[PDB]
Design a protein around this nucleic acid. Structure first.
Ligand SMILES: Nc1ccn([C@H]2C[C@H](O)[C@@H](COP(=O)(O)OP(=O)(O)OP(=O)(O)O)O2)c(=O)n1
Ligand SMILES: [Mn+2]
Ligand SMILES: [Mn+2]
Ligand SMILES: [Mn+2]
Ligand SMILES: [Mn+2]
Length: 438
DNA sequence: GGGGTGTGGTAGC
DNA sequence: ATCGCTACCACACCCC
């Protein structure tokens, strides 16, 4: 057990945090793409007609943790038992749950205690531990398989369990559903073999947005090919508004208020005007949703196809620790800030950059919120405060950065005992060139 | 037009 | 117990 004022806290927390693992795995994949392709020109041009294959593991953590489960879980059955991956037993996040669990209404991100309430009597939840190294190894097999197939011009990492793979069609070749179906089945079988039993589903389309919707329709353990010329009422009727890219809870709430509570993308499609859409959720989001409902990508989304190196290039660097923050005095806060800056500068030096602007964000307990929230060591109900500072010269100097980070904390005026979370950020990154005579 | 700030939402999730 | 991370875009509103 490692408390936040222990030097080992950052290491222990990140070792246990599945969300830290997801973010670090994604950042590593982005860096590997940029280094694999230092010379290879990977971009899609306007001359290219392309097909998108959006490929994603089915309940990734749950599948892998089950396949690699310890002897205590030998009799566990993946197709018959509701299985979750989590740390705890009560207010612990379900990182992933299998499709049996989902048939009862359980979802990723729910708390274990919330999920147990949805099971009828006689049905018990099986909770498996995290297997972080195996998650990474199966993802390696996944990405290696996608390359070995030699069928994609461009393989874009989306996450540990997910990639956008692009196939350019020569104007002389006649693409067919049958050819796409066989590619989907090849990919699914080769990854199933290469991962020793994990399944992926595949959305296949001529837009990024349709491939994402096709993928959702394909799941679990299937594929779906839906081109813009294949669009239909049956297709749109199969999705909730939440399924549209760019629509999270806050946008969903606004769309439900503005358009008489639609219950499918087919509902929304028939009720919306572009202008009321923009008014409800915002101008750029409203235009994105408008295009998405026609099967079409927006300018912002297409950038990853036409300039992936620029898109996947890292422009900021940060850490966020909003769990286990319980400090008694400012000396201990300041030491934690120093440890966080040391960790971030180690990353900054690994990528051979300097930073010219930094940000500190904190979570502060709301005045009438309990000192100890429902979730053990949780941040609880808070408000956020951030403040940033431009540095004189771009720097990688600990003394400058840590001093300014501690000044930003001082500026924000949060009593140490009220602190519930900290984020430390390097906002603008500058390359270190061969010439440093200044 | 150009620049900036802190806040908020969502993509990974 | 329990491990609620990270990057980027968009916005409202300020400067000149
Ligand atoms: N709230 C969440 C959502 C996802 N994940 C982790 C666990 C997932 O297994 C993994 C991949 O995320 P996905 O969105 O791809 O979800 P799954 O792979 O679990 O299920 P599926 O994609 O079949 O819906 O990311 C998490 O930790 N917390
Ligand atoms: Mn998945
Ligand atoms: Mn995924
Ligand atoms: Mn959504
Ligand atoms: Mn997902």
């Amino acid at each position: 057990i490692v408390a936040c004022d222990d030097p080992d806290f950052l290491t222990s927390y990140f070792a246990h945090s599945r969300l830290h693992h997801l973010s670090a795995w994604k950042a590593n994949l982005k860096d590997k793409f940029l280094n694999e392709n230092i010379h290879k020109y990977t971009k899609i041009t306007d001359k290219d007609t392309y097909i998108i294959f959006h490929i994603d593991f089915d309940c990734f953590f749950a599948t892998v943790a089950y396949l690699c489960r310890s002897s205590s879980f030998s009799a566990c059955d993946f197709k018959r038992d509701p299985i979750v991956v989590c740390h705890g037993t009560k207010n612990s996040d379900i990182a992933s749950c299998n499709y049996v669990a989902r048939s009862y209404g359980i979802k990723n991100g729910m708390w274990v205690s919330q999920a147990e309430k949805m099971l009828p009597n006689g049905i018990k939840l099986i909770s498996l531990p995290y297997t972080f190294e195996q998650f990474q190894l199966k993802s390696e097999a996944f990405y290696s398989t996608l390359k070995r197939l030699n069928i994609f011009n461009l393989i874009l990492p989306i996450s540990i369990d997910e990639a956008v793979c692009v196939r350019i069609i020569p104007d002389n070749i006649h693409n067919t559903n049958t050819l796409n179906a066989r590619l989907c089945e090849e990919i699914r079988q080769e990854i199933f073999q290469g991962t020793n039993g994990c399944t992926v589903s595949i959305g296949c389309s001529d837009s990024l947005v349709l491939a994402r919707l096709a993928l959702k329709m394909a799941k679990p353990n299937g594929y779906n090919i839906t081109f813009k010329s294949n669009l239909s009422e049956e297709f749109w009727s199969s999705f909730k508004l939440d399924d549209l890219p760019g629509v999270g809870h806050s946008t969903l709430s606004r769309l439900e208020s503005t358009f008489d509570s639609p219950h499918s993308l087919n509902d929304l499609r028939k009720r919306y005007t572009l202008d009321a859409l923009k008014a409800s959720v915002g101008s750029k989001l409203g235009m994105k949703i408008h295009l998405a409902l026609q099967g079409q990508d927006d300018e912002e989304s297409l950038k990853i196809l036409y300039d992936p190196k620029e898109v996947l290039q890292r422009k900021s660097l940060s850490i966020d620790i909003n769990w286990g923050i319980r400090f008694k005095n400012i000396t201990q806060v300041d030491l934690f800030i120093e440890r966080g800056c040391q960790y971030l500068l180690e990353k900054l030096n690994e990528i051979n950059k300097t930073t010219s602007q930094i940000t500190l964000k904190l979570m502060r307990r709301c005045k009438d919120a309990p000192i100890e929230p429902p979730k053990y060591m949780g941040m609880g109900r808070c408000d956020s405060f951030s403040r940033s500072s431009r540095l004189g010269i771009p720097t990688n100097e600990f003394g400058i950065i840590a001093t300014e980070m501690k000044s930003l904390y001082r500026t924000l005026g949060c009593p140490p005992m009220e602190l519930r979370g900290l984020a430390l950020q390097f906002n603008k990154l500058v390359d270190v060139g061969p010439d440093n005579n200044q």
